Design a protein around this ligand. Sequence first.
Ligand SMILES: Cn1cnc(Cn2c(=O)nc(Nc3cc4cn(C)nc4cc3Cl)n(Cc3cc(F)c(F)cc3F)c2=O)n1
Ligand SMILES: Cn1cnc(Cn2c(=O)nc(Nc3cc4cn(C)nc4cc3Cl)n(Cc3cc(F)c(F)cc3F)c2=O)n1
Ligand SMILES: Cc1ncc(C[n+]2csc(CCO)c2C)c(N)n1
Lengths: 302, 302
Amino acid sequence: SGFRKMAFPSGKVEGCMVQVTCGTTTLNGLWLDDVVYCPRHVICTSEDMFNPNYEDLLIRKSNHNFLVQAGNVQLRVIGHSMQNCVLKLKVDTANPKTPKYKFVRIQPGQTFSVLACYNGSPSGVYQCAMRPNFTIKGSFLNGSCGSVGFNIDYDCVSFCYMHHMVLPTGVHAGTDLEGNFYGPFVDRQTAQAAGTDTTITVNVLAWLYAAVINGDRWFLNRFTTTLNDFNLVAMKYNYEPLTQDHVDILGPLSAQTGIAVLDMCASLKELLQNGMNGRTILGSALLEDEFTPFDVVRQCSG
Amino acid sequence: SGFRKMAFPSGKVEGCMVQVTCGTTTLNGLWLDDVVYCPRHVICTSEDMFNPNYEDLLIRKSNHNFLVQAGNVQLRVIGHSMQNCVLKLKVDTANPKTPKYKFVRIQPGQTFSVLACYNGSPSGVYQCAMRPNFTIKGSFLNGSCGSVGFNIDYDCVSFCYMHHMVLPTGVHAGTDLEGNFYGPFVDRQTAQAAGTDTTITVNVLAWLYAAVINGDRWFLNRFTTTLNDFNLVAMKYNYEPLTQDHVDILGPLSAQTGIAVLDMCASLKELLQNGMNGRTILGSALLEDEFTPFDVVRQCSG
Ligand SMILES: Cn1cnc(Cn2c(=O)nc(Nc3cc4cn(C)nc4cc3Cl)n(Cc3cc(F)c(F)cc3F)c2=O)n1
Ligand SMILES: Cn1cnc(Cn2c(=O)nc(Nc3cc4cn(C)nc4cc3Cl)n(Cc3cc(F)c(F)cc3F)c2=O)n1
Ligand SMILES: Cc1ncc(C[n+]2csc(CCO)c2C)c(N)n1
């Protein structure tokens, strides 16, 4: 019973956060086995951040220019390399708290947990979605660079996000753990705009099913729609199109509630056209799109 | 808005979760030093759950009737006692992952992180507020009994909530770590109704300060009020009256913005009497009441 934004327990990741410093520049790193991963922006000085030539800056660096602190222990760097926008510091000590882990690149519309950290210390945890325009709407302050996002599946941590920067609209951009940005962004201190964001339609539908499972039905109706006719209306409102795969994924929620997927599409179509008339769904005045069908099933089965 | 419900990192609590089983009744417990804390409901058979005689259920029980497991490893119970609605099981091993900790009883309005657990295994973490009617709008399934709520200040975990039961409306009820229920509930499997809820005034005020901090301040009027006058008006709109402690925890935000607490009460009074008139605050037409003054500073300032 109930439905809330839920993050994975963050303990397995907390044991991996460290602080990395070059000169006066400092951010968070991820210590797995004998490697620390962190944004390569750390090698920038105040004058480099605007337009860094990273290969130039890195070749001028020695191992002892990197100071890595785990708690109050200093870790000795014995090698360094760059993979795209991620710096890899080889250290002489393996992290005994290293969990079983994978690096994955997540798809837009999928969710993950963010462990926000400052100076290598974990500060808070919360759930985010990869937006269709490759930004994330996180909660990050100065010093959060290098914080990571992840999912956990049977004691294996799949790291999918490393935080790099804040955009002028206050949304956030980062890379996978291979150092490739999500979206058309680049790691320099310039004002960067994202593409137009769209709403994750399959997630909104999942969250409507959550609302029904928790006893709210005011938005349901008796109208009918085809998948294509729903997608025409959805595109009009800058909603992502709904695929047959998405319809299939919503299957369990349809079975549970007895509401056909296309019947819930008919309900969403009306909400897009009429609005909510000051009413709320699961306490929200806006249509929530950062719950996947798996997130709803996980919280609402039974 | 840039505001998200953020949990504390859960690792310090994850290392304390265990499963406790009596016969087939099984739930979650909290292992700190050489004591495991858990709801006394675990000693009920199904026929006991409706109207248990705990004293009589406990006199029949011996140490060897309690199965306490960390993962699949059994912890031998060497003493047991009842304190209000919590059972305290003395075990023969001091938990090596015990953090610095305290037991605290919170007030309505205060927020905390919940580590939802099933069979001793943490499943997710999210932020909750204690409602004025002493329920929490959590997210809990069967098997969640004994999950705990907590805050972390510096490196000390303040435990404030242990989950006991779901109410007919789907909200949740439980105790502090001394076994004293929040609210008028008792640990019987009966349909107990929560009283009518109200809005957490101190947290709405914190939210208005957060809006001011971010430059959204159209709602600041030119008036002030006395605390007594504001309290009397607030109750007529199903808002909670303010306490002297409430005024004091608004102090840092009042100092940060230079807006006197009673001036902000006058501004909230005007919103109550007139409404938003089609206009929004931090992008929402709803006033948020589950961010405490500390949450606001935590998310604006760090
Ligand atoms: C408000 N906010 C929200 N998210 C963020 C993340 N973020 C950050 O934490 N730090 C950044 N720049 C740095 C400045 C430093 C000053 N010192 C002494 N050390 C510093 C280290 C960093 Cl990383 N940035 C900006 C930023 C970071 C990048 F990785 C990048 F490629 C471009 C950028 F403009 C930042 O956004 N802050
Ligand atoms: C849907 N939901 C949301 N929160 C909860 C919490 N909750 C719970 O997890 N378990 C409960 N009863 C038990 C049944 C058991 C069956 N087996 C095999 N083992 C069991 C252990 C428990 Cl604790 N309850 C009900 C409940 C638990 C209490 F502690 C109490 F005092 C009164 C109650 F009615 C429950 O609410 N479920
Ligand atoms: C945290 C943080 N880091 C860097 C800058 C950028 N900055 C400050 S002075 C200067 C010119 C070189 O001295 C630059 C690029 C910032 N604003 N905040």
